[PDB]
């Protein structure tokens, strides 16, 4: 009976705003690096 609130608090504090901010920064990094069309490759293909 007593383990349930402790487990709930462990779940709440494990998935706190730290993980949210970390995943947000991961998404921003992917958008700024992976989700960017490199004009260098475009110009290399055009010249080829």
């Amino acid at each position: 009976l007593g383990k349930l609130p402790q487990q709930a608090n462990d779940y709440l504090n494990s998935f706190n705003w730290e993980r949210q901010v970390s995943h947000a920064k991961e998404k921003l990094t992917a958008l700024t690096k992976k989700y960017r069309i490199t004009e260098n490759d475009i110009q290399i293909a055009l010249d080829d």
Partner: protein, 48 residues
């Protein structure tokens, strides 16, 4: 067809230069910058 080939080459080069001048990756990069600026302005991390 030496003149025909030369004119075709010139037209192809003009088309390539026009496409290089009017690209879309620059627009995509500007849009991504705008999106990042808006996300930073709204400050999702503080809200979460």
């Amino acid at each position: 067809f030496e003149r025909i080939n030369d004119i075709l080459e010139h037209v192809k080069h003009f088309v390539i230069n026009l496409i290089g001048d009017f690209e879309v990756a620059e627009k995509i990069n500007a849009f991504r910058a705008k999106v990042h600026e808006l996300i930073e302005r709204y400050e999702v991390d503080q809200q979460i």
